[PDB]
Design a binder for this molecule. Structure first.
Ligand SMILES: [Mg+2]
Ligand SMILES: [Mg+2]
Ligand SMILES: [Mg+2]
Ligand SMILES: [Mg+2]
Ligand SMILES: [Mg+2]
Ligand SMILES: [Mg+2]
Ligand SMILES: [Mg+2]
Ligand SMILES: [Mg+2]
Ligand SMILES: [Mg+2]
Ligand SMILES: [Mg+2]
Ligand SMILES: [Mg+2]
Ligand SMILES: [Mg+2]
Ligand SMILES: [Mg+2]
Ligand SMILES: [Mg+2]
Ligand SMILES: [Mg+2]
Ligand SMILES: [Mg+2]
Ligand SMILES: [Mg+2]
Ligand SMILES: [Mg+2]
Ligand SMILES: [Mg+2]
Ligand SMILES: [Mg+2]
Ligand SMILES: [Mg+2]
Ligand SMILES: [Mg+2]
Ligand SMILES: [Mg+2]
Ligand SMILES: [Mg+2]
Ligand SMILES: [Mg+2]
Ligand SMILES: [Mg+2]
Ligand SMILES: [Mg+2]
Ligand SMILES: [Mg+2]
Ligand SMILES: [Mg+2]
Ligand SMILES: [Mg+2]
Ligand SMILES: [Mg+2]
Ligand SMILES: [Mg+2]
Ligand SMILES: [Mg+2]
Ligand SMILES: [Mg+2]
Ligand SMILES: [Mg+2]
Ligand SMILES: [Mg+2]
Ligand SMILES: [Mg+2]
Ligand SMILES: [Mg+2]
Ligand SMILES: [Mg+2]
Ligand SMILES: [Mg+2]
Ligand SMILES: [Mg+2]
Ligand SMILES: [Mg+2]
Ligand SMILES: [Mg+2]
Ligand SMILES: [Mg+2]
Ligand SMILES: [Mg+2]
Ligand SMILES: [Mg+2]
Ligand SMILES: [Mg+2]
Ligand SMILES: [Mg+2]
Ligand SMILES: [Mg+2]
Ligand SMILES: [Mg+2]
Ligand SMILES: [Mg+2]
Ligand SMILES: [Mg+2]
Ligand SMILES: [Mg+2]
Ligand SMILES: [Mg+2]
Ligand SMILES: [Mg+2]
Ligand SMILES: [Mg+2]
Ligand SMILES: [Mg+2]
Ligand SMILES: [Mg+2]
Ligand SMILES: [Mg+2]
Ligand SMILES: [Mg+2]
Ligand SMILES: [Mg+2]
Ligand SMILES: [Mg+2]
Ligand SMILES: [Mg+2]
Ligand SMILES: [Mg+2]
Ligand SMILES: [Mg+2]
Ligand SMILES: [Mg+2]
Ligand SMILES: [Mg+2]
Ligand SMILES: [Mg+2]
Ligand SMILES: [Mg+2]
Ligand SMILES: [Mg+2]
Ligand SMILES: [Mg+2]
Ligand SMILES: [Mg+2]
Ligand SMILES: [Mg+2]
Ligand SMILES: [Mg+2]
Ligand SMILES: [Mg+2]
Ligand SMILES: [Mg+2]
Ligand SMILES: [Mg+2]
Ligand SMILES: [Mg+2]
Ligand SMILES: [Mg+2]
Ligand SMILES: [Mg+2]
Ligand SMILES: [Mg+2]
Ligand SMILES: [Mg+2]
Ligand SMILES: [Mg+2]
Ligand SMILES: [Mg+2]
Ligand SMILES: [Mg+2]
Ligand SMILES: [Mg+2]
Ligand SMILES: [Mg+2]
Ligand SMILES: [Mg+2]
Ligand SMILES: [Mg+2]
Ligand SMILES: [Mg+2]
Ligand SMILES: [Mg+2]
Ligand SMILES: [Mg+2]
Ligand SMILES: [Mg+2]
Ligand SMILES: [Mg+2]
Ligand SMILES: [Mg+2]
Ligand SMILES: [Mg+2]
Ligand SMILES: [Mg+2]
Ligand SMILES: [Mg+2]
Ligand SMILES: [Mg+2]
Ligand SMILES: [Mg+2]
Ligand SMILES: [Zn+2]
Lengths: 50, 77, 63, 252, 91, 112
RNA sequence: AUGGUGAACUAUGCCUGAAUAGGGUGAAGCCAGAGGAAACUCUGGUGGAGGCUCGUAGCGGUUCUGACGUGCAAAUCGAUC
RNA sequence: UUCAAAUGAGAACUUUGAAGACUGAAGUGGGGAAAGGUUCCACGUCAACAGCAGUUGGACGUGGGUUAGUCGAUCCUAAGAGAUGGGGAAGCUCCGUUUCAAAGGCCUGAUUUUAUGCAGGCCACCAUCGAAAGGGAAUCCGGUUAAGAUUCCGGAACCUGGAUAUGGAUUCUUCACGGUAACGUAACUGAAUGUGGAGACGUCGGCGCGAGCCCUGGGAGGAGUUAUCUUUUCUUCUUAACAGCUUAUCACCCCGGAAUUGGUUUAUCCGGAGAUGGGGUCUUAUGGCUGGAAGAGGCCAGCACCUUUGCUGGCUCCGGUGCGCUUGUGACGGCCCGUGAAAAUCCACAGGAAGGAAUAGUUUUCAUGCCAGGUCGUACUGAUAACCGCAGCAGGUCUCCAAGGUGAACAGCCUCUAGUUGAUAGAAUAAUGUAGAUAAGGGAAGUCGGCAAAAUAGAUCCGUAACUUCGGGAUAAGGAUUGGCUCUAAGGGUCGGGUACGAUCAACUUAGAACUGGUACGGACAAGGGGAAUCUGACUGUCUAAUUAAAACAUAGCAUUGCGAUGGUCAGAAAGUGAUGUUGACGCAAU
């Protein structure tokens, strides 16, 4: 770390973006079933394994 | 980066095509041990060197300043 | 203040001393000091003609 | 049980030689036209330490007979040879220390080093610090020449085997007690991973023919047969006698 | 002021290894370190430089020699033998 | 009192990571990294530094005028004068002694 | 049994780097001096040797069979070493 | 740990102020390597989470933030990895790496159908991957952000590639002069081929020098103390890369010709193979002066006004000290059966193919001038909460910088700078505990056993047995002494002397003598118990991570065995396979 391949930078980038809460307007959709974001990740409870 | 002393050689720089800007600086200093005197530095920005010419003589200073090319962009102080 | 009373020689008796005499000041430093002095007094006394080269070259090795 | 130590050596894992610092291979000149019809002059340019070797090497440079340039060879230095010396290699060359000559052209009693087993193998016999070989005969028909190797064995080779007059330098190296473990240590550190040596008798049976027992002991003759098989041959392999050697050796 | 009755340089090893090995070492040490005569420029300035390498302070020649002494008994006798056998070839 | 940090990511004391402390116009201490020292070119024959020649890290010699890279004499910035003196004598004498060898053996041949 | 995955721990070798307060001892070499008929023997200095020694950091892990023993901890903590 | 304020529905726990402490530069400081990956920063914010709390957070919501020709990568090669003509193998694939291979490409010439065929001459180097600590082209200061900075802004440089003209240099003696020489210089053509050097190299020791830090006088500011005392205590006073001149131990040259041997290092090395002496040449580490550059930065004072915030002044000066400390470097010296990488890349030289002037040629290794410099990383943490240990775990995890006193000291103990003041809290102080201490008289009677604990300890001086491999044993054992204050004496530098001394400056060391005290004084800290034997391993070293550290293993030493290569020992299913082997009996292998 602290001097990364672009490969790794990329992945970390993608990761940041998946780290939002459920966009609440999905909740309103007909037949919506997704309550919250069940795949949320947090830097000190689960490590990325790269 | 460069110092200069031939008051002739200097003048020749000041008309050296790429010499657009130049600058004259003034310093209070002291003479020998007793009193002070007005020192002036003649800086010319060549394309890769800043030549400066220290005229320690207030007299030769003034006469040198009207020697300056009328087309040069002299910065005063 | 203290540091003054040192170059006045105070606070320096046997009870104020924990490094061995040699730690406090090496023997060899003493020597090099002393030898270098004799060595060069000889040179001036030679340069000056006060002493002649034959006497100087014995005093040297004798130093 | 386990694969014993002397069987793991063959795969050369941790067991290869420690090579990084060695000067290069020590070899005589390629037996070309100059050396087998006349002689050719060189200059030892340097005599120098080879890591993990007893005896110093001698960098000796020659002229290329075929191109304008200097081709440098690495010799094992004979005692006496020196920086600046001129070295002569060839059939028709002269008999002084340092030169290299086919065993044919040296009278018996001549004493030479780095000798070839066949002509041109660029040097094979007596290279170790101290060692040499003495010519003891000639048989001009089928030009063979007989010599006594360092071991004691006598052998015969082509009279076109090249040798170099003199003994190998740095002799006597083995008279100085190593004194401590660390010197053997630094010794083998530039050779190979063969030191220290656990005795097989201090091992467990999986480890060795010698392992185990409530006291330490070989428990069977330690003279193993030639016909024995890997994993069996530790001890006195094919020993034709055994015990303290009494009275002068020296082959007859 | 005679500093040691017998160990000399071998004094460094203290009590270790046992007199005899120490005596054997002392001998070869004294040879190996000692300053030698240079056959070439005639000054005593040949000191050792890793076993069998003997090279001259002033004048800068290097000679392959014995592991702890310049010339080795063997070397020399061989040098004499080679003398003699060579002579046979011109006369 | 004032201490100092490295100025590059490498945190170790390698030969290529020497540091020198320095006083800036800001009135504080700052590290400055320092190139390894250049060694002196050596004489190809005898071995000394050869005098007359500048000392630069090897690629810096292409940023310097050719007079910094030689002395005038034959084998200028390559061999050490005394060494050239020597090889000249040797060259002359050997070539002379060479002629001696030839007329002497020409004599042998017609007087034998 | 068959086919696979491990040397991020650790063991060993190789390559390339880095790290180690302050003390005690005083080996070769060297200088000057003294005795003695002689052979030779003595003294004072200099010098700075060692898998040397006191002891931090380091590396280790001896005893308390100390703490803890549903722990800080699936091996740790303290003192002493 | 404490008081108060502010905030807030709510405050032991947030923010601010005050106070009391701590880490004590071997840091609880300032940064990095691996690893994490947004934790960084702002704003909002408390449902869960931070084993009390919570208005706070590395949590939660929403956003913002990581700027390079010069820093790294990228290139190089190391151990090693691994395609290829091949050889094995039913085959997945195994072996081979320059190997039993028809292995490939540069300089220009020949073109003036034309774009590039042939003409020479070479060179036979045979992939490639493998270092963010090895090798390596080149940047610095100041300023700036909520969060980036050797990356932005400012100024001032440098390297590499490409183009190029002007000036200077050089030539009618074509390819410069000068110097006796070491060699000098702004230049001062040079193909193939060859050679040389740099890259490029152990470790310890003392000695010499540099830099930064430390200590210190004077002066010009600002701050603190002032019942009393102190011309006082504290602090500011700085100068980057880069460039011109100058500067060095070593080394070398010229003159000279040496015993009465001289010169000379702390360390005994040097001289007829030319010393001592006198005169010069060189490297430019390093430093000095100037340019950069005072216009910056630092410290003050005097006005201005809600504001952005200005504005005007000054001063930023001269010195001293050294067994100091850290680091750098030099010439030396000890050591070795240890002698302590490679390659890219750069330059030089030997060579002389060639091309070149007087009506005008040659020259870009001299100066100046023009253009350009891609891609990816750059935030932060680096740990008693940003990494690994199920976790904000007393564990583990590579490194640089390093102030004052006491002291031998990077020890311990106290401090400055910086950083903390985190660890649920309140009230009591029963038993039994854990950790820290003391105890009359006796003194191991306790106990398997002196386990634990106590005793000893620094230094200076005196004194020191058996025995021994003569090196030790040895701090053997055994003794005395030690504060404070006031004196004394000894130990150095620098200068002029025609071809005996004087004058000044700057340092703690060592010994001696008075006086002095509730006989105390290494006053805390720090800091060996000693002796006589028996058993056993020679020693230093090694191991059972996590019940065994030992007498076990190792080791030097000793002895035996096998082997001359068509070989010994060992590897492999096999092979044009492999280890020892870059080897050769002073060797490898096996006990
Ligand atoms: Mg001494
Ligand atoms: Mg000194
Ligand atoms: Mg002196
Ligand atoms: Mg003398
Ligand atoms: Mg098996
Ligand atoms: Mg190998
Ligand atoms: Mg081993
Ligand atoms: Mg054994
Ligand atoms: Mg063994
Ligand atoms: Mg066992
Ligand atoms: Mg068995
Ligand atoms: Mg059996
Ligand atoms: Mg058994
Ligand atoms: Mg037995
Ligand atoms: Mg200060
Ligand atoms: Mg950094
Ligand atoms: Mg030159
Ligand atoms: Mg020069
Ligand atoms: Mg020429
Ligand atoms: Mg590992
Ligand atoms: Mg030390
Ligand atoms: Mg001590
Ligand atoms: Mg020590
Ligand atoms: Mg007498
Ligand atoms: Mg020592
Ligand atoms: Mg030790
Ligand atoms: Mg010890
Ligand atoms: Mg101590
Ligand atoms: Mg520890
Ligand atoms: Mg250990
Ligand atoms: Mg413990
Ligand atoms: Mg216990
Ligand atoms: Mg319990
Ligand atoms: Mg300890
Ligand atoms: Mg609290
Ligand atoms: Mg404190
Ligand atoms: Mg400390
Ligand atoms: Mg903390
Ligand atoms: Mg950081
Ligand atoms: Mg992380
Ligand atoms: Mg934050
Ligand atoms: Mg809540
Ligand atoms: Mg949490
Ligand atoms: Mg909670
Ligand atoms: Mg709560
Ligand atoms: Mg967030
Ligand atoms: Mg965000
Ligand atoms: Mg770079
Ligand atoms: Mg690239
Ligand atoms: Mg392969
Ligand atoms: Mg690569
Ligand atoms: Mg690299
Ligand atoms: Mg590197
Ligand atoms: Mg910004
Ligand atoms: Mg920052
Ligand atoms: Mg900045
Ligand atoms: Mg800029
Ligand atoms: Mg600019
Ligand atoms: Mg260019
Ligand atoms: Mg000229
Ligand atoms: Mg080359
Ligand atoms: Mg080289
Ligand atoms: Mg290297
Ligand atoms: Mg620079
Ligand atoms: Mg001189
Ligand atoms: Mg002269
Ligand atoms: Mg250091
Ligand atoms: Mg060496
Ligand atoms: Mg060069
Ligand atoms: Mg031609
Ligand atoms: Mg140019
Ligand atoms: Mg490109
Ligand atoms: Mg950063
Ligand atoms: Mg933290
Ligand atoms: Mg974790
Ligand atoms: Mg996990
Ligand atoms: Mg932890
Ligand atoms: Mg902190
Ligand atoms: Mg707790
Ligand atoms: Mg009692
Ligand atoms: Mg008693
Ligand atoms: Mg009893
Ligand atoms: Mg009793
Ligand atoms: Mg009882
Ligand atoms: Mg018992
Ligand atoms: Mg009993
Ligand atoms: Mg005890
Ligand atoms: Mg008591
Ligand atoms: Mg005994
Ligand atoms: Mg005793
Ligand atoms: Mg007293
Ligand atoms: Mg005095
Ligand atoms: Mg033992
Ligand atoms: Mg031990
Ligand atoms: Mg165990
Ligand atoms: Mg087990
Ligand atoms: Mg033990
Ligand atoms: Mg244990
Ligand atoms: Mg024995
Ligand atoms: Mg085959
Ligand atoms: Zn010589």
């Amino acid at each position: 770390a602290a001097q990364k391949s672009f490969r790794i930078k990329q992945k970390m980038a993608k990761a940041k973006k998946q780290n939002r809460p459920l966009p609440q307007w999905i909740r309103l959709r007909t037949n919506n079933t997704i309550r919250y974001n069940a795949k949320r990740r947090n830097w000190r409870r689960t490590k990325m394994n790269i | 980066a460069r110092e200069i002393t031939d008051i002739k050689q200097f003048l020749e720089l000041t008309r050296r095509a790429d010499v657009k800007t130049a600058t004259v600086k003034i310093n209070k200093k002291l003479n020998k041990a007793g009193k002070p005197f007005r020192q002036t530095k003649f800086k010319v920005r060549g394309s890769s060197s800043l030549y400066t010419l220290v005229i320690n003589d207030a007299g030769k200073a003034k006469k040198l300043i009207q020697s300056l090319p009328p087309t040069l962009k002299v910065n005063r102080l | 203040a203290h540091a003054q009373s040192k170059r006045e020689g105070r606070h320096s008796g046997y009870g104020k001393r924990k490094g061995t005499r040699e730690a406090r000041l090496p023997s060899q430093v003493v020597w090099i000091r002393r030898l270098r002095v004799l060595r060069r007094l000889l040179a001036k006394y030679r340069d000056a003609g006060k002493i002649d080269k034959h006497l100087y070259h014995v005093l040297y090795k004798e130093s | 049980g386990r694969v014993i130590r002397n069987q793991r050596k063959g795969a050369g894992s941790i067991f290869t030689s420690h090579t990084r610092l060695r000067q290069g291979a020590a070899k005589l000149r390629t037996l070309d036209y100059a050396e087998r019809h006349g002689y050719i002059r060189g200059i030892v340019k340097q005599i120098v330490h080879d890591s993990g070797r007893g005896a110093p090497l001698a960098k000796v440079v020659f002229r290329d007979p075929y191109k304008y340039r200097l081709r440098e060879e690495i010799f094992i230095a004979n005692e006496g040879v020196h920086t600046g010396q001129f070295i002569y290699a060839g059939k028709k060359a002269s008999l002084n220390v340092g030169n290299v000559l086919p065993l044919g052209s040296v009278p018996e009693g001549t004493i030479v080093s780095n000798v070839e087993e066949k002509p041109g193998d660029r040097g094979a016999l007596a290279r170790a610090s101290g060692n040499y070989v003495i010519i003891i005969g000639h048989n001009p028909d089928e030009n063979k020449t007989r010599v006594r190797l360092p071991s004691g064995a006598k052998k015969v080779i082509s009279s076109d085997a090249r040798g170099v007059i003199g003994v190998i330098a740095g002799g006597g190296r083995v008279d100085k007690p190593l004194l401590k473990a660390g010197r053997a240590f630094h010794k083998y550190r530039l050779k190979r991973n063969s030191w220290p040596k656990t005795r097989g008798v201090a091992m467990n049976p999986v480890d060795h023919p010698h392992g185990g027992g409530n006291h330490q002991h070989i428990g069977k003759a330690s003279t193993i047969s030639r016909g024995a098989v890997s994993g069996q041959k530790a001890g006195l392999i094919a020993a034709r006698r055994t015990g303290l050697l009494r009275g002068s050796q020296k082959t007859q | 002021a005679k500093r040691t009755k017998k160990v000399g340089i071998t004094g460094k090893y203290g009590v270790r290894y046992g007199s005899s090995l120490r005596r054997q070492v002392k001998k070869l040490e004294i040879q190996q370190h000692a300053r030698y005569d240079c056959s070439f420029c005639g000054k005593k300035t040949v000191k050792r430089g890793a076993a069998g390498i003997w090279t001259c302070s002033c004048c800068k020649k290097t000679v392959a020699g014995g592991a702890y002494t310049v010339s080795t008994a063997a070397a020399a006798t061989v040098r004499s033998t080679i003398r003699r056998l060579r002579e046979m070839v011109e006369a | 009192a004032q201490r100092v940090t490295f100025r590059r990511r490498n945190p170790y004391n390698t030969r290529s990571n020497k540091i020198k402390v320095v006083k800036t116009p800001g009135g504080i201490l700052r590290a400055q990294h320092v190139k390894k020292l250049a060694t002196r070119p050596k004489c190809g024959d005898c071995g000394s530094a050869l005098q007359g020649i500048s000392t630069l890290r090897p690629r810096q010699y292409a940023t310097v005028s050719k007079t910094h890279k030689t002395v005038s004499r034959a084998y200028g910035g390559s061999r050490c004068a005394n060494c050239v003196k020597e090889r000249i004598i040797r060259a002359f004498l050997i070539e002379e002694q060479k002629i001696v060898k030839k007329v002497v053996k020409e004599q042998t041949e017609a007087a034998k």
